[PDB]
Design an enzyme around this catalytic site. Structure first.
Site, mmCIF file in Angstrom:
data_model
loop_
_atom_site.group_PDB
_atom_site.id
_atom_site.type_symbol
_atom_site.label_atom_id
_atom_site.label_comp_id
_atom_site.label_asym_id
_atom_site.label_seq_id
_atom_site.Cartn_x
_atom_site.Cartn_y
_atom_site.Cartn_z
ATOM 1 N N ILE A 65 -7.740 2.428 0.779
ATOM 2 C CA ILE A 65 -7.373 2.100 -0.628
ATOM 3 C C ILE A 65 -8.287 0.702 -1.008
ATOM 4 C CG2 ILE A 65 -5.297 0.562 -1.687
ATOM 5 C CD1 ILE A 65 -4.429 3.217 -0.519
ATOM 6 N N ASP A 117 0.800 -1.174 0.090
ATOM 7 C CA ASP A 117 0.072 0.021 -0.010
ATOM 8 C C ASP A 117 0.915 1.355 -0.111
ATOM 9 O OD1 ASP A 117 -2.536 -1.001 -0.016
ATOM 10 O OD2 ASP A 117 -2.333 -1.737 1.921
ATOM 11 N N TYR A 168 -4.345 8.781 -0.732
ATOM 12 C CA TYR A 168 -5.824 8.574 -0.469
ATOM 13 C C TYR A 168 -6.374 8.764 0.914
ATOM 14 C CZ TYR A 168 -4.793 6.319 -4.835
ATOM 15 O OH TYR A 168 -4.318 6.262 -6.042
ATOM 16 N N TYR A 211 -10.166 -1.722 2.032
ATOM 17 C CA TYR A 211 -9.651 -1.427 3.105
ATOM 18 C C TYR A 211 -9.491 -0.146 3.511
ATOM 19 C CZ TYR A 211 -8.857 -6.439 4.746
ATOM 20 O OH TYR A 211 -9.077 -7.614 5.033
ATOM 21 N N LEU A 255 0.907 4.523 -2.578
ATOM 22 C CA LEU A 255 1.160 5.710 -1.868
ATOM 23 C C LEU A 255 -0.032 6.001 -1.004
ATOM 24 C CD1 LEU A 255 2.364 8.005 -4.997
ATOM 25 C CD2 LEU A 255 3.802 6.341 -3.420
HETATM 26 CU CU LIG Z 1 -7.422 -8.340 6.939
#
Ligand SMILES: [Cu+2]
Ligand SMILES: [Cu+2]
Ligand code: NA
Ligand code: NA
Lengths: 620, 620
Positions: free
Chosen positions: A371, A290, A299, A374, A295
């Protein structure tokens, strides 16, 4: 005035102007990364020279460039053409994500696969994911994304509830070509919705929660000056922000009497990897870096008062560059506040008759990033007693798949036909130490058990041993929770009043490290994640544990290459890299939206002070 | 009306009258323990019978007795004479503390030792410490306390700053004889004071802390009925108090829709031991069983609003018995409140456009106890998402010694000439489980690494394995942090909607267990502390991991004796005993009063619910 101030909109516009004037930012160019460089070592050095590092992508297929600019002097310092097949591709651009679904919607192999499943292409969302490095020779030197499909039944539907298993496609996002479409067979698309705001699923909302009101009638106890310099309860630090790393802490120091004592020169989360443990060919390539590939600062969420951050909140609104070099503000992207933290110290003494209670508090600096499915919260805490703590909070929607008939050893079942592949979330904290200055060393401390016998006749004694790590080749260390293993960072040239070197002790959570086979692609690309602790000698260009260009880069960069220099780290300018993470076997309670789970680490003083540093806290 | 209500002053008074009339409470008698007995197993137990268990000491030397009385019917149910050389001595009485210092003050060997050191006997405080069982055959069957000396320069002085090393005395507190005075040599008495309220040491108090105001303008979200029954955010439980264990939680259950689902039948901290690791004969016998020998509930603090407990606080004031059977109220001895706990769940979804944030909260039930130099806070937390957590907070003043010239492998230096011996603080949580009812089992869950090869061609797969513990002889388990080891308590006869058994997962902190040599006296008496997890079949007389009479018991009582029955625990009424602790190498920052350090464990639902249980939490 401060060299550590946040980048301003004017600085980013000036970088754009300098790059344009130099002929480096024409219409076919895109900025994939832009960030301010830290001052070089040397107290004072240049009176003021703000330098920026830029990664420049070319959408026509020409070689990208790495460029360093001086905004103060209006000059390009250096510009190098990159051979991406060798050193790695640039980070993924936000504009490349939308390309994937659009290209697949006109590919006859993709359309044939969806027709076999009776799916309407207009309802199929494609998650565009980083590609990694595997067996496909045609991908070398090309910018590839891989796509996994999910059905959205209507515009407000959670597509994650409806994975389309058995199907994956690979896309060259520069030439706009679909390179491969792989269809391993039809799986039923799970039909239950996962809409966590639908009253049909939530039921009636609770009416039982009474409000909790947290206010500071006289305002907060910290001060913010120069935009991002914080003073709070003897702590002093600068809060930075970088589009790759997110929040960065600079110049963490503690005012001990009349002396400002350094502790940490720079603290950041310098990488985070999310490897998936499902051997299905549809997902066995799936590994998110990530930080390095996407980056995380790009986000960052805007945080809402009273929802995301509760209490008397002070916000920072960092500025980043968009892909054309225009400044973009992340409004309310960093929350800062203090909070009560229960009892600090307490004793009721029978002999003296004195009853004594003091309360603790902590300073909180946080941001949240999203992201895809998540969402991660990054929290830094400073405590009255000198403790420094980091905590990551993982939430969002788990990544889903079909649940196979007959079961799986690598996938959890969440709902009828709906699975969630096993995975990990692993972070790397980069701590550029400065315990009372830059002459530091690391000792590994283990508990020592002693056998009953002479000098220990009752078999009760136990002890500890400390081992100094003297060179980088011996500074790659593993956790040992059974022996209470910790690591101490000390300054051998600065002693407390008992003539012992001052120090800080790192307490790990001792969670499992990377589980993948050591021969795998991910173990080579995320070598940092295979060990709990690394120590290197400071060097300006050794910034990330995975190297500068992580996207589609094979092994060969990052911490294993740094350590090979075998430099002296015994009383030198050193950097500690701590790996820590969560191993996630999803549970039913993680669906349809996951309650927060946490992981982190902390540092506590170890003879840094001459006595408790909180004797002057008032009773209130 | 509830069988689980707190003991009232009137019940204690009735017990005293019943004992007196039966001839069991003469002037030579003392109550060393008094507590209410839990109801026996019975899902239809209707007739109220409040029974109390009493340990009666005799100060003239007669045999002590264990008595059970019925307050409801006004009768003695049973009374048994105890042979303490066999089954152990009774807990230490508060009135025996003073006796040690007074007896030594007239002993000629003690006075000669003080005179050699030029110490005024009127300034010497003696810590009365439990004796254990070692090599002294004359102590078997006698009530012994051991004394270590500290100098108080003036009445408000902290005596812990001035240990008198090289000197220890043993005292028979029933016959009032000093059996041994051991003088191993003269150590300088450390001279610096440790008075943490003296402005010369604190310096000027900080003026920088601004207030944090935490209020609940509509009152708290929980309700209290029948004195000690709590309902809060779907949770239901009863808060008990026992003079030995402290706060006890009964009938922990969760309201899932229209069903009240049991989770834990009884939760308590059933023992805590503090073993010291200094091989000096002055201290090599030193092991506090704070719960079993001293009774942590009888030393509970009265907790002050705005200092110990901040916010909208509801207090309980438990009643205990003094040594003569009179009721004594511990005013404001238990704090209960809810507190904000940050983000519960959060996701911003690109495809649906929905931004979702919810906040978490926890219910806190706490009390604080003081045992000589140490002060411990016991905290139970209930979270919205079904998580149950315990946290111990350790503070107070460290136990001190001289710091030897030349140094020590077993003692830390805190100040000039002042040492602090290494020690541990080890707790045993006794969890009488009732996951959806009483038919439960425990599985041990380890992460499983997989080798790259057929069916795992990219070397990314990992898995997990679960092992059912079927008999007590295989239910003594060790932690393994490297393999992510946890334990799951499930109900094999109650399935979730996916047809999997419902369960809860225990997450340990994986700190070191007892470090003493396995052949030592403390390893035999605190055998529970040598392993992380024990599982037994429920029996109503198996209450403490160390047995009923811990003081001066020769060893093997409690858990080693229970599990030797090798009973079936696969789908049965079972009890989980979790050992967890802090290993304390004292640091300079712990002096002169120690900042809180913490340890604990938590339980999280594992397929207990059919989906997340917090979908109905409102945005607020
Ligand atoms: Cu997880
Ligand atoms: Cu301690
Ligand atoms: Na450094
Ligand atoms: Na049970």
């Amino acid at each position: 005035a401060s060299p550590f101030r946040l980048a301003s909109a004017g600085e980013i516009s000036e970088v754009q102007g300098i790059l344009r004037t130099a002929g480096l930012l024409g219409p076919e160019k895109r900025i994939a990364y832009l960030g301010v460089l830290d001052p070089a070592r040397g107290a004072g050095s240049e009176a003021e020279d703000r330098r920026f590092r830029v990664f420049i992508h070319d959408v026509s297929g020409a070689r990208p460039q790495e460029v360093t600019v001086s905004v103060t002097n209006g000059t390009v310092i250096s510009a190098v053409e990159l051979d991406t097949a060798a050193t790695g591709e640039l980070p993924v651009l936000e504009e490349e994500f939308e390309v994937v679904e659009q290209l697949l919607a006109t590919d006859e192999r993709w359309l044939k696969a969806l027709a076999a499943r009776n799916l309407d292409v207009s309802k199929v969302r494609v998650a565009p994911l980083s590609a990694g490095v595997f067996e496909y020779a045609e991908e070398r030197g090309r910018r590839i994304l891989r796509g996994l499909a999910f059905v959205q039944d209507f515009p407000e539907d959670s597509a994650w509830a409806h994975p389309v298993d058995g199907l994956v496609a690979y896309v060259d996002v520069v030439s706009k070509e679909v390179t491969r479409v792989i269809d391993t067979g039809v799986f039923p698309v799970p039909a239950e919705h996962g809409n966590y705001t639908d009253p049909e699923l939530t039921g009636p909302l609770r009416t039982t929660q009474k409000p909790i009101s947290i206010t500071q009638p006289e305002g907060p106890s910290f001060t913010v000056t120069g935009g991002n310099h914080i003073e709070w309860e003897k702590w002093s630090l600068d809060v930075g922000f970088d589009v790759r790393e997110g929040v960065v802490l600079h110049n963490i120091a503690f005012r001990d009497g009349d002396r400002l004592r350094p502790i940490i020169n720079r603290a950041s989360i310098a990488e985070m990897v999310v490897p998936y443990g499902d051997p299905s060919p549809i997902r066995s390539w799936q590994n998110y870096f990530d930080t390095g590939e996407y980056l995380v600062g790009q986000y960052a969420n805007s945080l809402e008062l009273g929802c995301d951050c509760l209490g008397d909140i002070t916000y920072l609104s960092p500025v980043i560059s968009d892909a054309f070099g225009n400044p973009r503000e992340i409004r309310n992207g960093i929350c800062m506040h203090e909070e009560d933290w229960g009892i600090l110290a307490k004793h009721s003494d029978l002999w003296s008759g004195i009853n004594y209670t003091r309360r603790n508090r902590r300073m909180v600096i946080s941001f949240f990033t999203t992201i895809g499915n998540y969402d991660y919260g990054f929290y830094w805490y400073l405590y009255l007693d000198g403790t420094i703590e980091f905590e990551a909070k993982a939430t969002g929607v788990v990544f889903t798949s079909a649940f196979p008939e007959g079961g799986s050893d690598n996938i959890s079942q969440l709902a009828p036909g709906l699975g969630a592949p096993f995975h990990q979330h692993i972070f790397s904290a980069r701590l550029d130490m400065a315990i009372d200055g830059f002459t530091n060393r690391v000792e590994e401390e283990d508990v020592v058990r002693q056998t009953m016998g002479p000098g220990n006749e009752r078999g009760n004694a136990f002890s500890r041993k400390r081992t100094v790590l003297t060179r980088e080749s011996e500074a790659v260390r593993e956790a040992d929770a059974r022996t209470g293993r910790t690591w101490i960072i000390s300054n051998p040239e600065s002693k407390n009043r008992l003539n012992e070197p001052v120090g800080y002790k790192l307490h790990a959570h001792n969670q499992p490290t990377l589980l993948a086979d050591p021969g795998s692609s991910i173990a080579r690309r995320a070598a940092f994640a295979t060990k709990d602790l690394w120590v290197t000698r400071y060097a300006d260009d050794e910034r990330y544990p995975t190297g500068d260009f992580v996207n589609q880069h094979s092994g060969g960069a990052g911490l294993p290459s740094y350590i090979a220099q075998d430099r002296d780290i015994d009383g030198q300018d050193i950097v500690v890299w701590h790996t820590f993470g969560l191993t996630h076997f999803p549970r039913v309670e993680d669906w349809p939206i996951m309650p927060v789970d946490t992981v982190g680490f902390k540092l506590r003083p170890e003879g840094f002070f001459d006595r408790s540093p909180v004797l002057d806290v008032p009773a209130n």
